[PDB]
């Protein structure tokens, strides 16, 4: 009882910055890229790893050499061959400073030889420690043991690009008219702020197992709008936010359609550490003391989000030694008194309060959390803090964070791979992902001496120390560990509710009748 049509409409939640995987860093972007392109390895509905462009792979016993065997007859959507040269080209372009990739640092996380030096402009991109041993053998050379390397390769930043096309056309290769990819789908249409339309890529190596023939991604920013369209039956899966007010109702009324995936994600307010006055540790500490997490998780959202005071989710692999900081165990009244003293010491008063804006991406749930935070900060400090809200469109919000044009910004980080360092690495001084501009050489040293570590206990202790240092510096304001609530029509199959990264590959779905 497979449906005859096999069409699906999904809310992607925003207009993506770009379809170039080297120019982007967000979930709307990766969701698109993952339909059009495929890296060495990919995943099933529960996030378990399965062959992608590589049909086979192995590692040396020291976990430093990774050899990928590519498919000898695999073709790009235009019929050009997919070779290890495309991977060499793409990974070089990622770390090349002229690309200005937001995820430039990702191959540094993988410990690829010379990756950090290329990022720092000290070596040329061609000096990166990856190679096409022949057209269908791609080898990756790491300077330290990286036993979790395969899982890293599934990330959008490590997707290959069609070298011959990109070289001919430059950055104009991403135009719908020119876009060539090696994933299960290709672009049929793109209307800015409205819809992206996908069609089968018939040259996909695994096209014979693809079931969905076509799909539409919408760009609905507000969960209530999302939910109304679902109810009208004009889309089949919502994005991963739902209205907290409607939620208990939706669960019972639309029983079996409400999915809630426990995800490897942390929601935070990021403090601009190099802008006055958030360069003052004392002020960063005040904000942390005075913000009640349980108010947001329990009363503003109440969907299963759990309160947290560290960046790494402690339930991630090798995260188990990370401790919640001591102040989180103190009464709020004790916390609030400390915050007021600190703010008074920094020269704030009811007459002259600490004034700043929360920047967030347009989204009613974010607005709700911002209003609560603003509200808690004023009341909890008896008028020493006065907060405004600045909402921006997704692309504009990303540009602002990246450019440092913010005081405090809503921030979500979802694991790029199921191991602690996907969070740990974010806060390195030199990480291209560090929009906080947090910099502590003791943090960097804690993480650096972890890559050397040979067993999981040793790595786990270093990550606990890194967290303790970020904690004492009050680098950001962690709030909660994510849950991913979505509505999914009963006739949509292949969505598990068990993928810790909550990826959606069209090629994993099918419609039943």
């Amino acid at each position: 009882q497979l449906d005859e049509k096999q069409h699906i409409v999904i809310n992607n939640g925003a207009e993506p910055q770009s379809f170039d995987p080297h120019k982007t860093e967000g979930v709307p972007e990766s969701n698109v890229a993952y339909q059009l392109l495929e890296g060495l390895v990919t995943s099933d509905s529960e996030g378990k790893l399965q062959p992608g462009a590589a049909e086979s792979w192995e590692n040396t016993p020291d976990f430093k050499t990774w050899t990928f065997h590519l498919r000898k007859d695999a073709k790009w959507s235009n019929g050009d061959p997919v070779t290890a040269h495309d991977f060499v080209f793409a990974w070089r372009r990622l770390v090349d400073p002229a690309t200005a990739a937001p995820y430039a640092s990702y191959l540094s996380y993988l410990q690829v030889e010379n990756a950090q030096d290329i990022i720092d402009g000290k070596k040329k991109p061609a000096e990166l420690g990856v190679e096409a041993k022949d057209d269908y053998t791609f080898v990756v050379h790491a300077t330290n043991p990286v036993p979790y390397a395969v899982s890293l390769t599934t990330h959008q930043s490590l997707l290959p690009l069609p070298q011959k096309v990109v070289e001919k056309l430059g950055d104009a290769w991403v135009k719908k008219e020119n876009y060539v990819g090696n994933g299960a789908y290709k672009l049929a249409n793109h209307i800015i702020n409205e819809k992206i339309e996908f069609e089968r890529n018939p040259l996909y190596w695994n096209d014979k197992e693809t079931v969905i023939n076509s799909a539409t991604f919408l760009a609905i920013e507000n969960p209530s709008t999302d939910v109304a369209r679902y109810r009208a039956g004009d889309l089949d899966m919502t994005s991963y936010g739902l209205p907290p007010e409607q939620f208990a109702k939706l669960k019972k009324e639309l029983l079996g359609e409400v999915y809630v995936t426990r995800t490897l994600g942390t929601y935070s307010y990021e403090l601009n550490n190099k802008k006055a006055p958030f360069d003052n540790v004392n002020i960063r500490k005040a904000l942390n003391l005075s913000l009640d997490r349980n108010v947001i998780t329990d009363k503003v959202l109440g969907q299963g989000q759990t309160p947290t005071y560290v960046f790494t989710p402690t339930y991630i692999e090798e995260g188990h030694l990370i401790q919640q900081p001591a102040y989180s165990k103190e009464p709020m009244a004790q916390r609030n008194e400390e915050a007021i003293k600190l703010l008074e010491e920094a020269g704030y008063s009811k007459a002259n309060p600490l004034k700043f804006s929360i920047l967030y991406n347009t989204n009613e749930n974010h607005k709700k959390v911002a209003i609560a935070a603003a509200s808690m900060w004023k009341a909890n400090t008896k008028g020493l803090i006065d907060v405004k809200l600045e909402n921006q469109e997704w692309k504009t919000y990303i540009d602002s964070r990246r450019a440092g044009r913010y005081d405090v910004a809503r921030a979500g980080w979802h694991a790029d791979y199921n191991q602690a360092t996907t969070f740990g690495n974010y806060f390195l001084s030199n990480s291209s992902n560090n929009t906080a501009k947090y910099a502590n050489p003791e943090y960097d040293k804690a993480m650096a001496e972890s890559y050397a570590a040979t067993d999981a206990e040793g790595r786990a202790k270093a990550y606990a120390k890194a967290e303790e240092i970020l904690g004492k510096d009050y680098g950001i304001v962690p709030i909660f560990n994510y849950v991913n609530p979505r509505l999914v029509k009963p006739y949509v199959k292949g969505y598990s509710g068990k993928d810790p990264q909550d990826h959606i590959y069209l090629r994993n779905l099918y419609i039943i009748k």
Binding site: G13, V27, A411, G412
Partner: peptide, 5 residues
């Protein structure tokens, strides 16, 4: 990756 949510 930075989430939309």
């Amino acid at each position: 990756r930075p989430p939309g949510f």
